[PDB]
Amino acid sequence: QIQLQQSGPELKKPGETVKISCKATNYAFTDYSMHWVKQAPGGDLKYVGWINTETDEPTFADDFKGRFAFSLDTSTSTAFLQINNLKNEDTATYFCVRDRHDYGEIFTYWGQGTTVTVSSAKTTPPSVYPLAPGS
Amino acid sequence: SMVTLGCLVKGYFPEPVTVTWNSGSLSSGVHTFPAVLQSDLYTLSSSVTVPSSPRPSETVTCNVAHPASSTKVDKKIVPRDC
Amino acid sequence: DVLMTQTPLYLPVSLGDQASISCRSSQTIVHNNGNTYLEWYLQKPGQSPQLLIYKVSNRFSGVPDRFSGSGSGTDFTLKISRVEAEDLGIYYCFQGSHFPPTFGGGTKLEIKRADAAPTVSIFPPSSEQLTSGGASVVCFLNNFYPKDINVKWKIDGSERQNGVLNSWTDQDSKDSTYSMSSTLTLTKDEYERHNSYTCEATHKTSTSPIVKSFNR
């Protein structure tokens, strides 16, 4: 019944900053550190890092060692992944996961994912053109 | 004899855009393709190969819905001829 | 950094067929604890990774007997025995032995069928986009199979290398086929300067590419 409900989609712009939530259900939220994974559109399943839910001490994989931040609210049991100086490459889907007190890792329970989209574009409607046979 | 018409949905942001054909009455041979990025906007297309006989007869409209702009726009296909 | 490598990139089979997908490790993956942490995830469309097997062979709580993990050292193999209609998705090996935990390449598990040729169609730009100034010539190569296929644009006899953005359908659900659009986009002025526009579909079901075109 352990659940890891995350936040809805986010249409951010290069530079803007974004914080993302991951609510933890049915378990001792502070006895298992949370993990964050990145999945670039169409594949790219990369690992962002983790934060010790006890001490709040974050651990980043070499590459997410720049604009990423991990933090949490215990009086709710919610982890957060924030990203700064927002680049285009950042667009993808971030999932929070956790283990089962195995020391070696086994990402068992994952979040549904929250997509973060980066684009200069401001909500602009499509122009429609009819593709009548020409040949 | 089959007639493939199409619909160029272009320059929209963000997503998504529901392309329907004939108010949802053409659920046969209809492909709405995955959007990409021409640069900073999304582009997508959609196809429907209808029987030769009925298309020219009439009723062949492309229906694209783009939830964000709360915009609904649909275009009927015309021969253009010459 | 243990680079997870998987094979094959794409694996198509019939229903009820046995599949054996494999993972390779740059370094061994026996964590200090005294155990290898090879993990098999199954991600469906627009979904998160379902752990299937653990510590090399330990199929997780609930995953069927069908799903079996093998291995020892760097080499491991997961293997289904009666592919059901819900096993399709992108399989992924993982490892929690070292840091950082790497994720395999992904083996897409799909359906196999009778190879079939495409239904190429070519459409010149519309009047309105043409006023707007842009000019997009589209080509649908719908319903072919296998997914491998290559479309070439040729303006006035000459091959047009740039300006095209392609976009692929996933395995068509109704019939297991694939479809695809290839769009070349010049400006009104570019498009204007020409006569003929060809879109050659070259599928393994032929030798001589399927050609369609138009003048102005």
From Swiss-Prot, chain B:
Covalent S-S links between cysteines? 7-62
Q: Where is this region: CH1?
A: 1-77
Where found in the cell? Cell membrane
What is the protein's name according to its record?
A: Ig gamma-1 chain C region, membrane-bound form
The organism of origin for this protein: Mus musculus (Mouse)
- Gene name linked to the record: Ighg1
Q: Which span of the entire protein is present here?
A: 21 to 102 of 393
